[PDB]
Structure 1
């Protein structure tokens, strides 16, 4: 129906505990929708929240790739230098083929906005036929990151 199935995983002790809301989730979802055309037609069909714990992250990534077979998973948060940030360690354990080019573009564009970009430790890669991309928690982040990738993500999903 929707061709490319996207899922978004918000990572955040605060949100997961119900101690605060998700401000970045909704922004991402909406960027994806707004980019559907240029993405080759894609839609978000699922979101979830988990705390900052690797096992918790690992599971969802496994589930959504092996069982639900999503095409594109974006994670938000837990990619910084704080000790609780372990999204990338969780992500590196489940991908099979790395995609450094994506990381390279995300790091290049974001460094044009600000140097603090050097603090993302985002990972990315493919598992089965799911592309997974770690992104930062800021609400505007997703917007800028997606702008950077959109010129090729289409061909990227097709090739998978």
Structure 2
């Protein structure tokens, strides 16, 4: 009963080494902390703002690595290339509106610019996928908004099956 987590950084800037990935490095620090989630980093990667490459990575981590949780950081704003939510929508099987709601209310409680965030939260197989903002402060804060329900959420999904495996079987 260990928690295998994947952190996926979506950003043309970090991908082209124009900037340091402080958000993703910090999330990896937050996910492994015993006082928080106490999980283990089982995957990490920086991809550009391309829906097809985000979708492929997500499917791989869910169907092949069978991670329990994937936190994506970046690509959830209004800027033209921000398509993380759209890629997430094409890969999830079941939507988790309550988690997206939790993070959005928390944000709008902080600033009206909170309505410029477009996160999607969903489930695929035994994996929960959470769209976090690209900034270090925001992804850390949003992660805290949902952290209380993550342990129970993950445990509920532990015995789910990877569809492509059932359909073939």
Partners of 1:138 and 1:114 lie apart in 2 by: 15
Secondary structure of 2:86's partner? helix
Aligned-residue CA RMSD (Å): 1.3
Task: Provide the residue aligned with 1:68 in structure 2.
Answer: 65
CA distance in 1, matches of 2:112, 2:147: 22
Deviation, structure 1 residue 19: 2.4
Shift of 1:38: 4.5
The count of residues paired between Structure 1 and Structure 2 equals 157
> TM-score scaled to structure 1, two decimals?
0.93
Q: Under a length normalisation based on structure 2, what TM-score does the superposition of the two structures give? A: 0.89
- Counterpart CA distance in 1 for 2:82 and 2:147 is 26
Q: Structure 2 residue aligned with 1:148, among 133, 145, 150?
A: 145
Q: Which runs of 5+ in 2 are unaligned?
A: 158-169
Partner residue in 2 for 1:9? 8
Give structure 1 stretches of 5+ with no counterpart: none
Corresponding residue of 1:50: 47
Matched residue of 2:91: which SS? Answer: coil
Aligned to 2:161: none
TM-aligned CA deviation for residue 45 of structure 1: 2.2
Distance 1:20 1:109 in 2: 27
Match of 1:30 in 2: 29
Extract structure 1 runs of 4+ deviating beyond 2 A: 36-39
Greater C-alpha radius of gyration:
2
Which of 119, 123, 134 is the aligned partner of 2:120? 123
